[PDB]
């Protein structure tokens with residue numbers, strides 16, 4: 001069971017004007033903090049984190065898969081491709097595509113990687129193989145960002161995101177090099193300095209993956225944090241709003257992350 005501080009969480013989303021989903025877990029004591037942990041939230045760009053873990057799982061079936069060169073034209077350059085478009089005239093390897101997708105939310109690199117895993121159904125198939133029965137990816141990049149209310153497409157729950165991130169970063173779902181390569185990619189993410197990272201002390205190691213749909217006030221972040229002298233903490237913070245024109249807030253994601261750490265005891 002949970003040691004929940006629901007009163008500050010409820011007032012936080014009251015000022016935000018939408019819904020906030022949080023699920024945190026102390027991997028040493030099993031204590032959990034859950035607020036709307038079973039509601040569905042649009043994944044947005046946060047699926048790229050599990051997309052890279054899927055490619056890392058296939059690298060165990062295909063040795064040296066991450067060093068495979070992949071060429072592409074402008075037609076594949078989806079808006080916001082700040083890494084893949086610089087290598088348009090030469091291409092990138094699969095490992096570089098995965099690093100760009102996780103660390104820079106590279107949309108072109110994500111579509112190119114999804115085309116190699118069997119599409120959104122292929123990535124969803126990998127999540128079922130690790131035990132995730134809530135995750136579902138339906139559309140390709142930028143289309144998956146519609147975040148329509150009541151739409152189960154391209155959604156998951158903060159609890160299922162947290163439990164899946166735990167099994168991929170600290171569990172047996174990946175081999176030791178594949179697991180360490182996943183943690184390294186999340187640690188080097190550059191998009192989450194104003195979210196979960198803003199609520200974590202600087203002397204703590206953290207690896208995160210963000211996601212911003214833009215519309216319906218839908219932004220999110222999940223991370224596994226490494227406090228000093230304690231067992232690691234895995235958490236997910238997901239937000240959405242009832243109106244299309246509603247804006248998201250990175251400070252609300254940081255504040256919810258701060259409340260989850262306090263509710264746990266760090």
Ligand SMILES: O=c1c2c3c(sc2ncn1Cc1nnn[nH]1)CCCC3
Nearest residue numbers: 078079080081082083085086104190
């Ligand atoms: O090029 C960058 C970069 C780069 C970064 S961050 C960034 N942000 C925007 N942009 C511009 C952009 N292009 N397409 N969407 N945004 C680091 C490596 C060098 C290129």
Ligand SMILES: O=c1c2c3c(sc2ncn1Cc1nnn[nH]1)CCCC3
Nearest residue numbers: 081082083086103104188189190191
């Ligand atoms: O934003 C940029 C950019 C941009 C460039 S280059 C560059 N380099 C780093 N960065 C920031 C950075 N990302 N990772 N390390 N540093 C051209 C278009 C505008 C944005």
Ligand SMILES: O=c1c2c3c(sc2ncn1Cc1nnn[nH]1)CCCC3
Nearest residue numbers: 045079080104105107191210211212
């Ligand atoms: O994805 C974008 C985008 C996009 C833009 S701007 C932008 N800036 C940062 N990022 C990086 C990011 N956002 N949330 N997590 N990481 C327009 C088309 C859709 C994608």
